[PDB]
Amino acid sequence: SQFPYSSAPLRSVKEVQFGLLSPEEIRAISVVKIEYPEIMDESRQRPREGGLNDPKLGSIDRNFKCQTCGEGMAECPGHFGHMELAKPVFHIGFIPKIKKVCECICMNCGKLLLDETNPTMAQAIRIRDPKKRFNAVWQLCKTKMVCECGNTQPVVRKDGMKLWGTWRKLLTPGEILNVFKHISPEDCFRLGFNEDYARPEWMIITVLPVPPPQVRPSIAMDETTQGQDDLTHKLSDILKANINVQKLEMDGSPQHIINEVEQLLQFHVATYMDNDIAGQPQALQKSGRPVKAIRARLKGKEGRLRGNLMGKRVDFSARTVISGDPNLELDQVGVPISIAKTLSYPETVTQYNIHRLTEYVRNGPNEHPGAKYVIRDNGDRIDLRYHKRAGDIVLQYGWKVERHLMDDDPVLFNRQPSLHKMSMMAHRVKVMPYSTFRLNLSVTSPYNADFDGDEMNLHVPQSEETRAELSQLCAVPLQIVSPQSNKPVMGIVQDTLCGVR
Amino acid sequence: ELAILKEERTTTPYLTKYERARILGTRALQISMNAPVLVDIEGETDPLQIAMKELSQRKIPLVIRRYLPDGSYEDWGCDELIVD
Amino acid sequence: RFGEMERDCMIAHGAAGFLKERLMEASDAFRVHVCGICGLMSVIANLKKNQFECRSCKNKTNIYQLHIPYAAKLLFQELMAMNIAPRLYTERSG
Amino acid sequence: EETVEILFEAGAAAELDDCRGVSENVMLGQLAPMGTGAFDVMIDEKLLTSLPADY
Amino acid sequence: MFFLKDLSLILTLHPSYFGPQMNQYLREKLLTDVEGTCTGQFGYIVTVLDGMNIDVGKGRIIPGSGSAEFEVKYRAVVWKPFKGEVVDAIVSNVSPIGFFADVGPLNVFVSTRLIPDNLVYNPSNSPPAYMSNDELITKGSKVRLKVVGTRTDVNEIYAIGSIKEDFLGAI
Amino acid sequence: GLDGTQVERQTIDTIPGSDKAFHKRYYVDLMDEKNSIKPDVIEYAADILGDVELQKELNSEYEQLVSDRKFLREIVFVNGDHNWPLPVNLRRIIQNAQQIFHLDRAKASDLTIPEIIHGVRDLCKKLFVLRGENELIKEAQQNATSLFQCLVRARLATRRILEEFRLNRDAFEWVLGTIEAQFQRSLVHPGEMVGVIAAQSIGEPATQMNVTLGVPRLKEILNVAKNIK
Amino acid sequence: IALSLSESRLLIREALKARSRARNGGVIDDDELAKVTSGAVANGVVKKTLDYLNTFARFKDEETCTAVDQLLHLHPFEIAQLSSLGCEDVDEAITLIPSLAAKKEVNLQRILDELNRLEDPY
Numbered sequence A: 001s002q003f004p005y006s007s008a009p010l011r012s013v014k015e016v017q018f019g020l021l022s023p024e025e026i027r028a029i030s031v032v033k034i035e036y037p038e039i040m041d042e043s044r045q046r047p048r049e050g051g052l053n054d055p056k057l058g059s060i061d062r063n064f065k066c067q068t069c070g071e072g073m074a075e076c077p078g079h080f081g082h083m084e085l086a087k088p089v090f091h092i093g094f095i096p097k098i099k100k101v102c103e104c105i106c107m108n109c110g111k112l113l114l115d116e117t118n119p120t121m122a123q124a125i126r127i128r129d130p131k132k133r134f135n136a137v138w139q140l141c142k143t144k145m146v147c148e149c150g151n152t153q154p155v156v157r158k159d160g161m162k163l164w165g166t167w168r169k170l171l172t173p174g175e176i177l178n179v180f181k182h183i184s185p186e187d188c189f190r191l192g193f194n195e196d197y198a199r200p201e202w203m204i205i206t207v208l209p210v211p212p213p214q215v216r217p218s219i220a221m222d223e224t225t226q227g228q229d230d231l232t233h234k235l236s237d238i239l240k241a242n243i244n245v246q247k248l249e250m251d252g253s254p255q256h257i258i259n260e261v262e263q264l265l266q267f268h269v270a271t272y273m274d275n276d277i278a279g280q281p282q283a284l285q286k287s288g289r290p291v292k293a294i295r296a297r298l299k300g301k302e303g304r305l306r307g308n309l310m311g312k313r314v315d316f317s318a319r320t321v322i323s324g325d326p327n328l329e330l331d332q333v334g335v336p337i338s339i340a341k342t343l344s345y346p347e348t349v350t351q352y353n354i355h356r357l358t359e360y361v362r363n364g365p366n367e368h369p370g371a372k373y374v375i376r377d378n379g380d381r382i383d384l385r386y387h388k389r390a391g392d393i394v395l396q397y398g399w400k401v402e403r404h405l406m407d408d409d410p411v412l413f414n415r416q417p418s419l420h421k422m423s424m425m426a427h428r429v430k431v432m433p434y435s436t437f438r439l440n441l442s443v444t445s446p447y448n449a450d451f452d453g454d455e456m457n458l459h460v461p462q463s464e465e466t467r468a469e470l471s472q473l474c475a476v477p478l479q480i481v482s483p484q485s486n487k488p489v490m491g492i493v494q495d496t497l498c499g500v501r
Numbered sequence B: 001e002l003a004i005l006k007e008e009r010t011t012t013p014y015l016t017k018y019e020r021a022r023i024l025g026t027r028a029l030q031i032s033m034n035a036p037v038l039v040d041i042e043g044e045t046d047p048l049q050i051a052m053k054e055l056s057q058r059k060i061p062l063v064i065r066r067y068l069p070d071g072s073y074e075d076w077g078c079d080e081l082i083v084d
Numbered sequence C: 001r002f003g004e005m006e007r008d009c010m011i012a013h014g015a016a017g018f019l020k021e022r023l024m025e026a027s028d029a030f031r032v033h034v035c036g037i038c039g040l041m042s043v044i045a046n047l048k049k050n051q052f053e054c055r056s057c058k059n060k061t062n063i064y065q066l067h068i069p070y071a072a073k074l075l076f077q078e079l080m081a082m083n084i085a086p087r088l089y090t091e092r093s094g
Numbered sequence D: 001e002e003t004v005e006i007l008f009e010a011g012a013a014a015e016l017d018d019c020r021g022v023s024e025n026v027m028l029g030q031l032a033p034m035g036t037g038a039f040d041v042m043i044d045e046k047l048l049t050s051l052p053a054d055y
Numbered sequence E: 001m002f003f004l005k006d007l008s009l010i011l012t013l014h015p016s017y018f019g020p021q022m023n024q025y026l027r028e029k030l031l032t033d034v035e036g037t038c039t040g041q042f043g044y045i046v047t048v049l050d051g052m053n054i055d056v057g058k059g060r061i062i063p064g065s066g067s068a069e070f071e072v073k074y075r076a077v078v079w080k081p082f083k084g085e086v087v088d089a090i091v092s093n094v095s096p097i098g099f100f101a102d103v104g105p106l107n108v109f110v111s112t113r114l115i116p117d118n119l120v121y122n123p124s125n126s127p128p129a130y131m132s133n134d135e136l137i138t139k140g141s142k143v144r145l146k147v148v149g150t151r152t153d154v155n156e157i158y159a160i161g162s163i164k165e166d167f168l169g170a171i
Numbered sequence F: 001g002l003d004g005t006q007v008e009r010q011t012i013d014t015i016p017g018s019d020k021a022f023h024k025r026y027y028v029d030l031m032d033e034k035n036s037i038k039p040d041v042i043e044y045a046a047d048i049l050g051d052v053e054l055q056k057e058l059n060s061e062y063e064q065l066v067s068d069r070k071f072l073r074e075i076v077f078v079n080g081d082h083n084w085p086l087p088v089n090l091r092r093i094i095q096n097a098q099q100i101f102h103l104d105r106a107k108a109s110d111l112t113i114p115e116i117i118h119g120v121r122d123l124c125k126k127l128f129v130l131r132g133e134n135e136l137i138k139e140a141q142q143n144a145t146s147l148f149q150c151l152v153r154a155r156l157a158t159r160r161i162l163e164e165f166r167l168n169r170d171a172f173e174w175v176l177g178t179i180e181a182q183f184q185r186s187l188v189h190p191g192e193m194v195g196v197i198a199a200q201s202i203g204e205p206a207t208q209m210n211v212t213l214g215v216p217r218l219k220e221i222l223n224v225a226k227n228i229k
Numbered sequence G: 001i002a003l004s005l006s007e008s009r010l011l012i013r014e015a016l017k018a019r020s021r022a023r024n025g026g027v028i029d030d031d032e033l034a035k036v037t038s039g040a041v042a043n044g045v046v047k048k049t050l051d052y053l054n055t056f057a058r059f060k061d062e063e064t065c066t067a068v069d070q071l072l073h074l075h076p077f078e079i080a081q082l083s084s085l086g087c088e089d090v091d092e093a094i095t096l097i098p099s100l101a102a103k104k105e106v107n108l109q110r111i112l113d114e115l116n117r118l119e120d121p122y
């Protein structure tokens, strides 16, 4: 409900399919073609229309909004760009797979080394799991050397990062890419790939996706004068490599030198994507530490999958010491003015409540009653602290206002440990001075608490459904009789018991 | 193909506390976002109070779909459900 | 802290809406628009104009919305940077 | 564990997730089938038609 | 080619619209967003069958949002071209590199290369037309052509025809 | 099918007592005056003696009570315990009816025997736990309310209503309606997460805790130890 | 659902008159009936479809369509193709519709007779 209204139907995912980014799809999803070399346009302020900080990709600047989606930074997720490489390059993750696939079928014609006459091939095809089919095809095709064309199949060996054929010639990315381009759909299915989506020509990298600055954290350790992440530096190095690869194809230069520079660009992109590469050094930063490749960003303790997240402002809970108060109802809780001001409840402006809500807004966040933030329909958050014109603010219907915690507001209240279901109950707020929560004596027994310094936790619902659920299900009077032993759990205790005796 | 006939309904005719809470919450949300109000407003401004007033007069334009364990469901109008 | 025992207490109370709020508001929930055909990150949405456009499929007819952890959103974005595509489908295939 | 090799195999043979586990729906944030979430609420068109002309 | 097809749609209604406008108002959004609109799966939905009597059903309330989700089910009429389909076209425009012919609610471009070499084009002749001995093709004529391929443009799908096959022409 | 918060300790009056006391408390005979209803509590005493049909009705009621006695003693509670948790406090309802309608001041009741018997039977047929016309549903509904039906038939006997409670027509109808409504209010709501409630209500008493007893015995039971201590 | 041109015209005509009675609420040729609708893209699609149907009018009678249905109601696609495209003899009918050759029950002489005999001859 906190999000601005969207007419799109709200559903849930039931199947996620890992595929491959085809270059045409990479271009389609990219918001703008990017070719300009460096980040800064002319050292004359503003982002470069064609730089690594292109505003079309979605910046991370608070005062600036992404031009593609038109949303604010609180809603803009960022947008992708694509960098086209003139020379197609291998994929470091798939180079062993590239060699395995090259050894799978005949590179001369694109056909399998064995036909369907073998019942084992028919069984592998009929196997539902593509992994088992691929494994069976590889196991039963390694022994067979002749293809299904009379041409001897050269053996592909991985030397460093290059692939060499033993019939001989060095494997070239253009010819390999064309060889995949000649693969029939039935050979695509037999190999374990999907002709429509997981089409085996996608392991050839021709265009690389540059992500928005949201993906990598560019920490602003000091105002405007900042550096960049290792990913940005490696992307710049890759672009320089691609530029000097492009600039060495129309002019006369040795072919082996051209291939060596191409392998240089390949190693650049490999170190950018994969850090722990076997048999070759990793990309080391100027400080000597390895460059944090994107492969390690999702693996390991430093990886995001195990868990690493930061950055949010949540203040919807409190915890403090308590004391007794005989002058409170059974369902009332005393709340300090400071705690009430710290917490807030977002109320939507209607015709009935507009007057008192405008009064609360005019009061400001430093006085009780009052409000802290005003959210527009689109989601802009006006902070009343920095808005010196709060006395000249009008509110339209549908706007939200985060007002102070007020009387009779249902709040959830808990003691640790919460052994039983009535250790957490919904109370009505009464705002009173000084810095202790106040409770009725009779509810201390179900809480199993005393006022010798024990601490209690408080939560505030942020929606009408939650407020109604707290007021109709977790209310204090509803918890007087427990289902454990069909007897009341709250009774007259201590001074009141002695006095009534 | 799965709906139960109205005369063949076998569930309880009373409004359970969970159903009451959900109906009150949903009606309060709808009223809070400027939905038309089915009952006159005397002096109250709280959406939950208005929702409770509507419920007391059986003026809730909502239908409960009680799901049987197999997958079938029964449709009950909030007007035809007994409220204590 | 909202631990496991508090979750069990609120389960006993049967207030599913509060569980949803805790699982979303006290976590990394974020709204994401996904094409119902491609399932990629190619959706441009204008709420004031009430329009949607999938630049991957040239689709402006049906685009769904989901609530996802934004840590998973960053993971999905760098997974696009992996040049391997998670195609999100809201319907199973069997 | 083994996320890099999981992605490798996924790119190799188009891995698919059934999403049958409760963890997927917890990650998605759908109302649980318990308590208040043990049923569905539908708008009553017939009652709205039976409402006055203003409603 | 005309067909009768059963269609379903997802509608989202804001709670501020919850009044005496349940049936007809949702129906008119359905007509605006469906009637006269093309889809890749079932071509052009030119009109609907029994528009005012379309059952909107019961709208599910999405929890935590209040918006009502409607499954609008109906039966309508659609137009679909097919590969290899032989149709008679009313040619609308003639250009030196072919002709535009309007079929149904769409237009098909047929190039000059596929046109047989007996039929010769003339811009100097009035009107600029494809003529020859006892043969004439100009705007306002019925030309029998077979569709070679249809392009799924989603918004307004197109197709291409040809007359380079036997027994093709006015009969 | 009942909620745990809607049960209180109540006594089944048929279980205890001797056979002679049971006969004195429940049996009614319209032939002998000493075994009949006392004339000072009903306005129509002279119209009762010799009535064959009312005698047959009372005989049927007594046979039902005897069957309930035998079923409770020989099957359910062999040890003879009569106090058990049951829904709907009948005694509180009866005294509330007495206070509301001022059933004091020893005024002869206008309630008739067939009215009382038919009302009790209809109330015993209206305690709906499960609904539906299926044979299995009807059998389960009959089985689920056997003990409560026995309690109601034991408390609302003809002699107990007339001589002891002295209910009138309005009080009797109000009692029947209140009992039906309160039983309908004591059912468990569908969608209750009873598993967590049971787990918490079992774990909690362990906090305040010759053969092995206490927490070690509890752990032995829960772990299903092959060789206990 | 396979559909020929004749009952397609019947369906669109009855839908147009029904929406004129209902949607317009108080409202006969092709052009102005096409112009009744609203929406520029919708107006263009509707007018193009209606002028295409009017310029290609095959069946304009209701009881004749009923008689044709009674005589016919045989692949549904074949049924649609029989009425959509006119024929004169088997030699070109099998050329336009190849399914007529592999039937073993041709009966095309009579079928063409009622096709070109019930209404105004083509």
Ligand SMILES: [Mg+2]
Pocket (backbone or CB within 6 Å): A449, A450, A451, A452, A453, A454
């Ligand atoms: Mg203490």
Ligand SMILES: [Zn+2]
Pocket (backbone or CB within 6 Å): A057, A058, A066, A067, A068, A069, A070, A071, A076, A077, A078, A079
């Ligand atoms: Zn953006």
Ligand SMILES: [Zn+2]
Pocket (backbone or CB within 6 Å): A106, A107, A108, A109, A110, A111, A147, A148, A149, A150, A151
């Ligand atoms: Zn070969």
Ligand SMILES: [Zn+2]
Pocket (backbone or CB within 6 Å): C035, C036, C037, C038, C039, C040, C042, C054, C056, C057, C058, C059
């Ligand atoms: Zn898409």
